[PDB]
Paper text:
It is composed of two N-terminal Eps15-homology (EH) domains, a putative coiled-coiled domain, five SH3 domains related with a sequence identity of 30%–40% (SH3 A, B, C, D, E), followed by the DH and PH domains and a carboxyl-terminal C2 domain. A number of studies have addressed the pathways downstream of the intersectin-1L GEF activity, which is highly specific for the Rho GTPase Cdc42. The intersectin-1L SH3 domains negatively regulate the in vitro GEF activity of the adjacent DH domain.
We were unable to crystallize the SH3(E)-DH-PH fragment, but the SH3(E)-DH fragment (1151–1431) yielded well-formed, hexagonal-shaped crystals, belonging to space group P3221 with two chains in the asymmetric unit. The linker connecting the SH3(E) domain and DH domain (1204–1225) is well ordered in both chains of the asymmetric unit, with residues 1210–1214 unexpectedly forming a short α-helix. The DH domain (1226–1431) is an elongated helical bundle structurally homologous to other DH domains of known structure. The SH3(E) domain from one monomer forms an intermolecular interaction with the C-terminal half of the DH domain from the second monomer. This interaction occurs side of the DH-domain opposite the Cdc42 GTPase binding site. It buries 534 Å2 of surface area on the DH domain, and involves contacts with the first half of α2, the middle fragment of α3, and one face of the c-terminal region of α6 (with the other face of α6 interacting with the DH domain from the other chain).
Numbering used by the authors: -1 to 0, 1151 to 1426
The structure:
């Protein structure tokens, strides 16, 4: 089964059929036949490598990636550490996510609603209820920030499910946005093909350093990506919350609201794509 590993030491290839890598480098594992020589790939290059020189990423403590600076982290149980780790993966990636949404508007939406290089409808077709998403997610973010503040600067957070359980219901605008992003994507391509003024303008918009080289056709995919990601993170938090824990019940409720949001979103996408045959 495909998975990632990180190099725990440097390794120079000793034979032509080997994969050389550096400490800290992540390599994609293609197979683990030989329990000593994994087949890996790094940047399109495939080779065998010593399995004892590597560490599965899934075996890495999540608190070490998302909150290594948490206070008293080393005093917590191994299971509460993972719980803090996943809680912070949720909060950190949310900050990351909300800011990217904002970024799209600032450097792509507004600069296009002024470009006059396309109608008022052609802007809705691409960004649809994008602004609406920024609103319900900013609400979530603010709520998480507050809980984070309530808990103490770099202090373990005890509850999170209540906020997610409460916040997920307002995520309904995603069904609409995700359902229409398929055309919005076609639109952007049509224009960047028929309107030379367009291809150039949107090419300039995208070179803003904060885009790190990502075209608007990929930023537009983020709302869907975020919706499918939630369940995954919430389930990991739940799994590290015992049933006698005061947040357990909320987490269970939140996982559920998150899973169906994702279902509703995916149903809408399919529905909308099917109706484009009638």
């Amino acid at each position: 089964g495909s998975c990632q590993v990180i190099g725990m030491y440097d390794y120079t290839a000793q034979n032509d059929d080997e994969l050389a890598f550096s400490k800290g480098q992540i390599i994609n594992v293609l197979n683990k036949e030989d329990p000593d020589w994994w087949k890996g790939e790094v940047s399109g290059q495939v080779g065998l490598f010593p399995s004892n020189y590597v560490k599965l990423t899934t075996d890495m403590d999540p608190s070490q990636q998302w909150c290594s600076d948490l206070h008293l982290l080393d005093m917590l149980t191994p299971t509460e550490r993972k719980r803090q780790g996943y809680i912070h993966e949720l909060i950190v990636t949310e900050e990351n996510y909300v800011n990217d949404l904002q970024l799209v508007t600032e450097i792509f939406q507004k600069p296009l609603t002024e470009s006059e290089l396309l109608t008022e409808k052609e802007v809705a077709m691409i960004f649809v209820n994008w602004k609406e998403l920024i609103m319900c997610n900013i609400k979530l973010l603010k709520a998480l920030r507050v809980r984070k503040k309530m808990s103490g600067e770099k202090m373990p957070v005890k509850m999170i499910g209540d906020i997610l359980s409460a916040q997920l219901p307002h995520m309904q605008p995603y069904i609409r946005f995700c359902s229409c992003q398929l055309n919005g994507a076609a639109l952007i391509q049509q224009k960047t093909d028929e309107a030379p003024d367009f291809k150039e303008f949107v090419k300039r918009l995208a070179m803003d350093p904060r885009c790190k080289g990502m075209p608007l056709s990929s930023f537009i995919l983020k709302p869907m990506q975020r919706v499918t990601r939630y369940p995954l993170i919430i389930k990991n938090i739940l799994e590290n919350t015992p049933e006698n824990h005061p947040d357990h019940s909320h987490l269970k409720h939140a996982l559920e609201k998150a899973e169906e949001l994702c279902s509703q979103v995916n149903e809408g996408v399919r529905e909308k794509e099917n109706s484009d045959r009638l």
